[PDB]
Amino acid sequence: GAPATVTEQGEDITSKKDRGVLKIVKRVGNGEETPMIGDKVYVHYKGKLSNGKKFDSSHDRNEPFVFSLGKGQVIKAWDIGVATMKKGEIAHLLIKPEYAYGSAGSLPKIPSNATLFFEIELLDFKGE
């Protein structure tokens, strides 16, 4: 299903071309701007371990997930991936641990060396 599709077909959006962050655009967005470092960004998301065994969503809190891009408030893979997204876009990301929580992990939610999958909808972004 979705994570395997991203393995198979996604674009490697890493600078190092190490396949650490793979992307598919699932729904195309509007306009020419993409976020840049410093922007306040608003998303809805659905995440899970690519194994499938935990499944976290902004909708579980009935409100958008808000963060400042490139301020290390989210994992490196979000700073990289959301920077590529247009407003209204829905994208699938598949993320190696190097761009997420690494060999240390983040227990109890995230084990060591975890690959992560997200669907992200970019709702809006505003310049600091």
Ligand SMILES: COc1cc2cc(c1OC)OCCCn1cc(nn1)C[C@H](C)COC(=O)[C@@H]1CCCCN1C(=O)[C@H]2C1CCCCC1
């Ligand atoms: C490692 O801890 C969590 C990881 C994740 C969600 C968490 C975590 O809290 C213990 O709580 C969800 C409550 C809302 N929320 C999200 C954040 N802050 N509050 C950003 C997090 C502090 C860091 O999260 C991230 O960088 C990414 C991207 C933004 C959305 C949440 N992220 C996660 O890694 C999720 C994770 C997704 C895979 C399945 C388990 C939860």
